[PDB]
């Protein structure tokens, strides 16, 4: 703003595991020549 | 810092915030502010000492 | 604040056995923070080294010192470190300790007066002790230097318990002894934090750090000129405040 | 069939695997089973026994790694309570590290190599960063030379390469091969491999990385 | 002498407090003043620097929205959504991996007060000697080591102050050895209703509730306040009465104590010693306090009277049931700015004297008990939560908003034990639903003809009566029209008579609407049994409300009316239904000198064009409550009407008035103007009525 970006209001990225979303899904969806289909979310992590 | 913007010239502020387990140049009342220009689509390297 | 200069090391480069990268050639001078040099062997009987120019083209203060490290390529968890400064003895940082454990002193000597100013900021809640002394010995050393005084009365007493007559102990850095100015057979009125102590029971030490205040006294046969009489006075009334009434808080 | 989620790990970490079970038509069932966890000399250090009933198949469980343990390879060996003559097992390795920044691929232009050839062996050098930007640095290469239990090392052959926007190129003659070995007759080497090794460092002095490609 | 000038806050007004030595600011509910809340004078004549967790000068005074802290780590799991801050009354869900077991809550969402509303989310295996402690929302863990005999460390981020255990070690039993920290903020205070369930929690043991005692055992309580210059009220007047009554409610459990009273402002003094042997009753020791006078001509050394307590417990060989005898401390210090020596090392050398952590085998944790309590704004945290004791599944440190909170604590603490038989009690616990908070809240759902639905609202007066806005119900309304949900449950009930007010009427003049007496009762012929999810409300001027105020009883009911409407704003509040739950919505009622300035504006009213006398259908017994005045707070609803108004005092709720109507239709856009105004009944001009006709019940009506 008014002033020049300094160094007191700024989040920093903390998450770096090595392995995540261990979940189990199920499908049963109604069918569509045999095909059932699942939309799922997910929030990624902070690794580059 | 990794800077890839195509056609830009960064001039950055760095600061390495204290901590009491550690001693550094960085007190209470006085801490750590560096400032450095990046050429575009490159890296710099800034070293800092702990104890 | 420091850079090489290039025609040092491209001369370097131009020799035998050094090899410099191509790419490190077109880093102008602003930006060389890091420098990497690659040697084809090293003996194992004499010493063949090498040395360059260092120039500045910034003023900073408190200067970090540097850093040199060597290794061989395989083996990388086998390698040696070194530092530097030049107003520095063998580039370590200072800090102050016996073995175990202890904290640092990168900080300043002292902080900097009216009577009101004494009278308020004197009842901090931080503060522990308010001491009169007269200092009866010096000591100095290599890592830190010592003084040794004698306690006239317990003004203001905090966690540690005295009485008249005992000695205590001292300690400070190297570069505040300009700063204090101390002569033998002076007397010095003191007020410091808690944070200080140092060591422990019952061996405790005082450390002079940037928060501890000590002022000058003078002999009670000069409190009739007009030296330090307004202070004279002045002291006299806050000793007699806080020992009568106290503090307001 | 076992299933680990990770390959390597650290002391004070979690191990998470899975089992899965099936028939000679490959098909879901439900029977007892029993795990156990072997240490890299051999002795067990716990043994568990389940039973997969209700779940369509599948066995999640855990272990927690101690901080003061052993290093190098450990085993989960699994079997059927009814048939203890026959085991399944998996591999897994315990070692403390720090991740790494970008990948390293060594590879040569012909799988075999015709000893009747005047251009020795050739073999080119690819880094890459993860995220998909390329890599600037320098190699150093080393060949060898593997029998049967048993490898040498050629100390005539070691080369140092700029690596530039991802691409170095080694060659290897045949008089350094033939003077490495007290083999003239060239007919004699049908029956031994050859393999490379590498080493990237970065021009920031930062990362190293050891890529080898053998047989 | 101290500028005096400027000192303006925005968005909320500013008091000065001791004779212009100090200033507080304040804001309205839902914000807090940055950086600091009551700055002082010095003698120097320059106001205090502002003093923030990093002293962090601003040059403006102006209160900011209520933030809820954000969670740092969590181990094995994930939770929806995130952001870098969460406003208030957002949710948050926890969901974990697969092959484990999730305790605790699965939905968590932050209130007003500033804190996640439920417990810890902790997701366990199950592999280990002792389970796991989970991560507090806003802290950092360190250990992962779950076997016996090792430890564990917590600590938080920046700005934020702890409370509660550093470390924590897993003793032999199996449970760990402390308490749960969760570190706090500047701006977040406690309530009088969970400061009194925790200490009555922790004071004693369930079975009701008694306090257990080995035999030939005894308890010794000892209760240290202090002096100093921090209040300055006469001679120590307000904790006269709270330490009445905690006399009371302790001798009320059938114990025999021994008291000892001490107090401190820079030399210990004592007035009742535990060795007496007159101080084993209540009377002697009451009469002792009620002569407590005033001597300071300041300071405060917590070190001496700490001592002082220690040489009164001491024993000159040890008598008999030394070994069987339990110390309470209750220490009301609202500074602990200690000047003169650190407090720990005597409570160390205290709990050396009784053998207490000189052991392996057998610990003997409980027969030490320190409770303290703090008072104001310029209470120091750290220095507080360093003194008192920690134990597990219990807390120890309370910290207050004002002295009145004190009395309001000690009150509501001996009105808890009493029967069902009072006026307008809640007692929530810890697991409660939204009915247990508000008991008394009735509805009624009406299909009236040529129209669709009809839902009001209403209050239970009593067994028998029962009051709804006269709006929602006619003359012409029959037995299919009345149906009644109380108890929280849909089952009817058989009624008996309907009651009107007589001048109530809604009849040329450009005005269709005449919303004078708005008033309906409902007459039953059946006795309800009062439990725990219902419970009947409170009215003015009857015995009942004045034994309810802590008065006298020669108040008179102008006097009554006086103290409950003064002519200044007063806070009040409507029990909204939203989202088909039910939530309290703060407003401001306006019965001084500016109800004309709120009436002022009442002919922007659809309808009103030929109003010819601006009160000929704005009755004087109109209030006028909501608007811009002086901050823009939500109005009412005219689809929603019907429900009760309740003024909050005393930790007690008292009915006003019946909601009538509002200025505008605004709120069924909730998917507020400034003339948006509220206009409701005043229930004392409709007292002849209620007089004349509730001569029958005998609720003390007078
Ligand atoms: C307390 O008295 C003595 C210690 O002097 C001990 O023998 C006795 O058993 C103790 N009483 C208890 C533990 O109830
Ligand atoms: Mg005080």
Same mark, same amino acid.
């Given at each position: 703003?008014?002033?020049?970006?300094?160094?007191?209001?700024?989040?920093?990225?903390?998450?770096?595991?090595?392995?995540?979303?261990?979940?189990?899904?199920?499908?049963?969806?109604?069918?569509?020549?045999?095909?059932?289909?699942?939309?799922?979310?997910?929030?990624?992590?902070?690794?580059? | 810092?990794?800077?890839?913007?195509?056609?830009?010239?960064? %001039?950055? &502020?760095?600061?390495?915030?204290?901590?009491?387990?550690?001693? =550094?140049?960085?007190?209470? %009342?006085? &801490?750590?502010?560096?400032?450095?220009t990046?050429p575009?689509? =490159?890296?710099?390297?800034?070293?800092?000492?702990?104890? | 604040?420091?850079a090489?200069?290039?025609?040092?090391?491209?001369?370097?480069?131009?020799?035998?056995?050094?090899?410099?990268?191509?790419?490190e050639?077109?880093?102008?001078?602003?930006?060389?923070?890091?420098?990497?040099?690659?040697?084809?062997?090293?003996?194992?009987?004499?010493?063949?080294?090498?040395?360059?120019?260092?120039?500045?083209?910034?003023?900073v203060?408190?200067?970090?010192?540097?850093?040199?490290?060597?290794?061989?390529?395989?083996?990388?968890?086998?390698?040696?470190?070194?530092?530097?400064?030049?107003e520095?003895?063998?580039?370590?940082?200072?800090?102050?300790?016996?073995?175990?454990?202890?904290?640092?002193?990168?900080?300043?000597?002292?902080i900097?007066?009216?009577?009101?100013?004494?009278?308020?900021?004197?009842?901090?809640?931080?503060?522990?002790?308010?001491?009169?002394?007269?200092?009866?010995?010096?000591?100095?050393?290599?890592?830190?230097?010592?003084?040794?005084?004698?306690?006239?009365?317990?003004?203001?007493?905090?966690?540690?318990?005295?009485?008249?007559?005992?000695?205590?102990?001292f300690?400070?850095?190297?570069?505040?002894?300009?700063?204090?100015?101390?002569?033998?057979?002076?007397?010095?009125?003191?007020?410091?934090?808690?944070?200080?102590?140092?060591?422990?029971?019952?061996?405790?030490?005082?450390?002079?750090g940037?928060?501890?205040?000590?002022?000058?006294?003078?002999?009670?046969?000069?409190?009739?000129?007009?030296?330090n009489?307004?202070?004279?006075?002045?002291?006299?009334?806050?000793?007699?405040?806080?020992?009568?009434?106290?503090?307001?808080? | 069939?076992?299933?680990?989620?990770?390959?390597?790990?650290?002391?004070?970490?979690?191990?998470?695997?899975?089992?899965?079970?099936?028939?000679?038509?490959?098909?879901?069932?439900?029977?007892?089973?029993?795990?156990?966890?072997?240490?890299?000399?051999?002795?067990?250090?716990?043994?568990?026994?389940?039973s997969?009933?209700?779940?369509?198949?599948?066995?999640?469980?855990?272990?927690?790694?101690?901080?003061?343990?052993?290093?190098?390879?450990?085993?989960?060996?699994?079997?059927?309570?009814?048939?203890?003559?026959?085991?399944?097992?998996?591999?897994?390795?315990?070692?403390?590290?720090?991740?790494?920044?970008?990948?390293?691929?060594?590879?040569?232009?012909?799988?075999?190599?015709?000893?009747?050839?005047?251009?020795?062996?050739?073999?080119?050098?690819?880094?890459?960063?993860?995220?998909?930007?390329?890599?600037?640095?320098?190699?150093?290469?080393?060949?060898?030379?593997?029998?049967?239990?048993?490898?040498?090392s050629?100390?005539?052959?070691?080369?140092?390469?700029?690596?530039?926007?991802?691409?170095?190129?080694?060659?290897?003659?045949?008089?350094?091969?033939?003077?490495?070995?007290?083999?003239?007759?060239?007919?004699?080497?049908?029956?031994?491999?050859?393999?490379?090794?590498?080493?990237?460092?970065?021009?920031?002095?930062?990362?190293?990385?050891?890529?080898?490609?053998?047989? | 002498?101290?500028?005096?000038?400027?000192?303006?806050?925005?968005?909320?007004?500013?008091?000065?407090?001791?004779?212009?030595?100090?200033?507080?600011?304040?804001?309205?509910?839902?914000?807090?003043?940055?950086?600091?809340?009551?700055?002082?004078?010095?003698?120097?004549?320059?106001?205090?620097?502002?003093?923030?967790?990093?002293?962090?000068?601003?040059?403006?005074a102006?209160?900011?929205?209520?933030?809820?802290?954000?969670?740092?780590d969590?181990?094995?799991?994930?939770?929806?959504?995130?952001?870098?801050?969460?406003?208030?009354?957002?949710?948050?869900?926890?969901?974990?991996?697969?092959?484990?077991?999730?305790?605790?809550?699965?939905?968590?969402?932050?209130?007003?007060?500033?804190?996640?509303?439920?417990?810890?989310?902790?997701?366990?295996?199950?592999?280990?000697?002792?389970?796991?402690?989970?991560?507090?929302?806003?802290?950092?863990?360190?250990?992962?080591?779950?076997?016996?005999?090792?430890?564990?460390?917590?600590?938080?981020?920046?700005?934020?102050?702890?409370?509660?255990?550093?470390?924590?070690?897993?003793?032999?039993?199996?449970?760990?050895?402390?308490?749960?920290?969760?570190?706090?903020?500047?701006?977040?205070?406690?309530?009088?209703?969970?400061?009194?369930?925790?200490?009555?929690?922790?004071?004693?043991?369930?079975?009701?509730?008694?306090?257990?005692?080995?035999?030939?055992?005894?308890?010794?309580?000892?209760?240290?306040?202090?002096?100093?210059?921090?209040?300055?009220?006469?001679?120590?007047?307000?904790?006269?009465?709270?330490?009445?009554?905690?006399?009371?409610?302790?001798?009320s459990?059938?114990?025999?104590?021994?008291?000892?009273?001490?107090?401190?402002?820079?030399?210990?003094?004592?007035?009742?010693?535990?060795?007496?042997?007159?101080?084993?009753?209540?009377?002697?020791?009451?009469?002792?306090?009620?002569?407590?006078?005033?001597?300071?001509?300041?300071?405060?050394?917590?070190?001496?009277?700490?001592?002082?307590?220690?040489?009164?417990?001491?024993?000159?060989?040890?008598?008999?049931?030394?070994?069987?005898?339990?110390?309470?401390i209750?220490?009301?210090?609202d500074?602990?700015?200690?000047?003169?020596?650190?407090?720990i090392?005597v409570?160390?050398?205290?709990?050396?004297?009784?053998?207490?952590?000189?052991?392996?085998?057998?610990?003997?944790?409980?027969y030490?008990?320190?409770?303290?309590?703090?008072?104001?704004?310029?209470?120091?945290?750290?220095?507080?939560?360093?003194?008192?004791?920690?134990?597990?599944?219990?807390?120890?440190?309370?910290?207050?908003?004002?002295?009145?909170?004190?009395?309001?604590?000690?009150?509501?603490?001996?009105?808890?034990?009493?029967?069902?038989?009072?006026?307008?009690?809640?007692?929530?616990?810890?697991?409660?639903?939204?009915?247990?908070?508000?008991?008394?809240?009735?509805?009624?759902?009406?299909?009236?003809?040529?129209?669709?639905?009809?839902?009001?609202?209403?209050?239970?007066?009593?067994?028998?009566?029962?009051?709804?806005?006269?709006?929602?119900?006619?003359?012409?309304?029959?037995?299919?029209?009345?149906?009644?949900?109380?108890?929280?449950?849909?089952?009817?009930?058989?009624?008996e008579?309907?009651?009107?007010?007589?001048?109530?009427?809604?009849?040329?003049?450009?005005?269709?609407?005449?919303?004078?007496y708005?008033?309906?009762?409902?007459?039953?012929?059946?006795k309800?049994?009062?439990?725990?999810?219902?419970?009947?409300?409170?009215?003015?001027?009857?015995?009942?409300?004045?034994?309810?105020?802590?008065?006298?009883?020669?108040?008179?009911?102008?006097?009554?009316?006086?103290?409950?409407?003064?002519?200044?704003?007063?806070?009040?509040?409507?029990?909204?239904?939203?989202?088909?739950?039910?939530?309290?919505?703060?407003?401001?009622?306006?019965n001084?000198?500016?109800?004309?300035?709120?009436?002022?504006?009442?002919?922007?009213?659809?309808?009103?064009?030929?109003?010819?006398?601006?009160?000929?259908?704005?009755?004087?017994?109109?209030?006028?409550?909501?608007?811009?005045?002086?901050?823009?707070?939500?109005?009412?609803?005219?689809?929603?009407?019907?429900?009760?108004?309740?003024?909050?005092?005393?930790?007690?709720?008292?009915?006003?008035?019946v909601?009538?109507?509002?200025?505008?239709?605004?709120?069924?856009?909730?998917?507020?103007?400034?003339?948006?105004?509220?206009?409701?009944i005043?229930?004392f001009?409709?007292?002849?009525?209620?007089?004349?006709?509730?001569?029958?019940?005998?609720?003390?009506?007078?």
């Open positions: 703003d008014e002033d020049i970006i300094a160094e007191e209001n700024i989040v920093s990225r903390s998450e770096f595991p090595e392995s995540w979303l261990w979940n189990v899904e199920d499908l049963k969806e109604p069918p569509k020549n045999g095909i059932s289909t699942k939309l799922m979310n997910i929030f990624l992590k902070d690794s580059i | 810092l990794y800077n890839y913007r195509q056609n830009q010239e960064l %001039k950055v &502020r760095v600061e390495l915030l204290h901590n009491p387990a550690f001693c =550094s140049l960085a007190t209470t %009342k006085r &801490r750590h502010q560096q400032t450095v990046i575009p689509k =490159s890296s710099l390297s800034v070293p800092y000492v702990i104890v | 604040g420091f090489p200069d290039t025609d040092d090391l491209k001369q370097l480069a131009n020799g035998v056995d050094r090899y410099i990268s191509k790419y050639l077109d880093k102008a001078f602003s930006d060389r923070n890091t420098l990497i040099i690659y040697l084809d062997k090293v003996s194992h009987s004499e010493d063949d080294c090498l040395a360059f120019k260092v120039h500045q083209y910034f003023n203060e408190l200067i970090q010192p540097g850093a040199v490290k060597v290794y061989a390529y395989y083996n990388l968890e086998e390698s040696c470190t070194r530092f530097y400064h030049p520095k003895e063998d580039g370590k940082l200072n800090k102050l300790c016996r073995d175990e454990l202890c904290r640092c002193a990168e900080e300043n000597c002292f900097q007066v009216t009577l009101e100013e004494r009278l308020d900021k004197a009842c901090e809640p931080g503060v522990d002790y308010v001491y009169k002394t007269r200092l009866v010995k010096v000591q100095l050393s290599n890592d830190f230097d010592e003084y040794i005084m004698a306690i006239e009365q317990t003004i203001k007493s905090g966690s540690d318990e005295v009485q008249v007559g005992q000695q205590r102990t300690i400070s850095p190297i570069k505040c002894r300009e700063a204090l100015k101390l002569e033998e057979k002076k007397h010095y009125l003191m007020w410091g934090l808690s944070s200080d102590f140092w060591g422990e029971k019952p061996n405790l030490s005082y450390i002079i940037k928060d501890t205040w000590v002022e000058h006294w003078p002999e009670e046969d000069e409190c009739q000129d007009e030296e009489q307004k202070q004279c006075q002045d002291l006299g009334a806050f000793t007699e405040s806080m020992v009568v009434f106290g503090c307001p808080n | 069939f076992i299933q680990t989620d990770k390959t390597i790990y650290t002391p004070g970490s979690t191990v998470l695997y899975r089992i899965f079970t099936v028939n000679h038509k490959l098909l879901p069932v439900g029977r007892t089973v029993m795990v156990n966890i072997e240490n890299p000399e051999g002795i067990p250090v716990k043994q568990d026994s389940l997969s009933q209700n779940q369509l198949g599948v066995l999640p469980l855990s272990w927690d790694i101690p901080e003061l343990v052993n290093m190098g390879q450990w085993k989960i060996r699994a079997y059927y309570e009814n048939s203890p003559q026959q085991v399944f097992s998996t591999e897994f390795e315990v070692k403390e590290y720090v991740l790494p920044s970008f990948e390293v691929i060594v590879e040569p232009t012909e799988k075999f190599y015709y000893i009747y050839n005047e251009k020795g062996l050739e073999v080119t050098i690819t880094a890459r960063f993860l995220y998909g930007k390329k890599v600037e640095g320098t190699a150093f290469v080393i060949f060898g030379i593997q029998d049967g239990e048993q490898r040498i050629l100390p005539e052959s070691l080369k140092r390469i700029p690596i530039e926007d991802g691409s170095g190129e080694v060659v290897l003659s045949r008089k350094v091969l033939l003077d490495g070995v007290q083999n003239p007759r060239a007919e004699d080497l049908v029956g031994k491999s050859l393999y490379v090794s590498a080493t990237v460092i970065l021009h920031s002095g930062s990362d190293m990385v050891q890529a080898e490609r053998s047989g | 002498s101290c500028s005096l000038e400027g000192v303006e806050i925005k968005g909320g007004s500013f008091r000065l407090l001791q004779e212009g030595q100090a200033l507080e600011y304040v804001c309205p509910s839902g914000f807090y003043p940055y950086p600091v809340q009551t700055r002082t004078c010095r003698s120097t004549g320059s106001w205090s620097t502002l003093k923030t967790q990093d002293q962090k000068t601003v040059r403006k102006e209160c900011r929205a209520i933030h809820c802290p954000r969670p740092h969590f181990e094995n799991g994930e939770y929806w959504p995130r952001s870098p801050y969460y406003n208030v009354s957002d949710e948050i869900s926890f969901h974990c991996y697969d092959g484990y077991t999730l305790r605790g809550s699965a939905n968590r969402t932050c209130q007003v007060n500033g804190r996640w509303s439920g417990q810890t989310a902790i997701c366990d295996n199950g592999a280990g000697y002792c389970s796991n402690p989970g991560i507090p929302i806003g802290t950092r863990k360190v250990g992962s080591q779950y076997r016996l005999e090792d430890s564990v460390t917590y600590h938080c981020s920046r700005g934020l102050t702890l409370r509660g255990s550093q470390r924590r070690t897993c003793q032999e039993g199996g449970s760990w050895s402390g308490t749960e920290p969760s570190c706090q903020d500047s701006f977040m205070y406690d309530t009088p209703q969970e400061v009194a369930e925790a200490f009555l929690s922790s004071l004693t043991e369930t079975i009701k509730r008694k306090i257990v005692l080995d035999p030939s055992g005894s308890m010794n309580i000892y209760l240290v306040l202090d002096g100093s210059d921090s209040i300055g009220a006469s001679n120590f007047t307000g904790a006269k009465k709270c330490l009445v009554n905690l006399i009371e409610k302790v001798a459990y059938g114990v025999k104590p021994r008291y000892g009273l001490v107090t401190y402002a820079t030399y210990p003094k004592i007035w009742v010693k535990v060795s007496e042997a007159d101080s084993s009753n209540a009377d002697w020791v009451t009469k002792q306090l009620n002569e407590i006078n005033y001597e300071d001509h300041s300071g405060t050394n917590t070190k001496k009277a700490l001592q002082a307590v220690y040489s009164m417990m001491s024993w000159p060989v040890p008598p008999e049931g030394w070994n069987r005898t339990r110390h309470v209750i220490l009301m210090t500074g602990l700015h200690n000047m003169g020596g650190d407090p090392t409570i160390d050398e205290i709990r050396d004297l009784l053998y207490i952590g000189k052991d392996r085998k057998n610990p003997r944790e409980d030490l008990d320190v409770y303290v309590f703090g008072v104001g704004p310029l209470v120091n945290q750290v220095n507080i939560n360093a003194l008192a004791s920690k134990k597990d599944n219990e807390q120890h440190v309370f910290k207050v908003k004002d002295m009145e909170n004190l009395e309001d604590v000690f009150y509501q603490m001996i009105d808890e034990s009493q029967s069902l038989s009072l006026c307008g009690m809640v007692w929530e616990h810890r697991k409660g639903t939204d009915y247990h908070k508000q008991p008394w809240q009735a509805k009624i759902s009406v299909i009236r003809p040529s129209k669709g639905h009809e839902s009001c609202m209403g209050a239970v007066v009593s067994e028998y009566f029962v009051l709804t806005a006269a709006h929602c119900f006619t003359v012409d309304d029959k037995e299919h029209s009345i149906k009644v949900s109380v108890g929280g449950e849909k089952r009817d009930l058989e009624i008579v309907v009651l009107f007010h007589p001048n109530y009427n809604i009849n040329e003049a450009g005005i269709p609407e005449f919303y004078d708005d008033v309906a009762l409902i007459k039953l012929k059946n309800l049994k009062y439990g725990q999810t219902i419970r009947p409300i409170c009215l003015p001027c009857t015995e009942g409300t004045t034994r309810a105020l802590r008065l006298p009883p020669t108040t008179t009911c102008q006097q009554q009316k006086e103290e409950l409407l003064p002519a200044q704003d007063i806070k009040a509040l409507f029990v909204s239904e939203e989202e088909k739950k039910l939530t309290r919505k703060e407003v401001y009622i306006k001084g000198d500016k109800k004309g300035s709120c009436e002022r504006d009442a002919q922007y009213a659809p309808g009103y064009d030929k109003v010819k006398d601006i009160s000929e259908v704005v009755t004087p017994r109109f209030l006028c409550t909501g608007g811009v005045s002086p901050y823009a707070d939500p109005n009412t609803c005219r689809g929603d009407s019907g429900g009760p108004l309740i003024v909050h005092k005393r930790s007690r709720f008292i009915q006003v008035g909601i009538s109507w509002g200025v505008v239709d605004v709120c069924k856009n909730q998917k507020v103007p400034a003339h948006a105004r509220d206009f409701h005043n229930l001009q409709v007292l002849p009525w209620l007089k004349e006709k509730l001569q029958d019940e005998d609720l003390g009506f007078l």
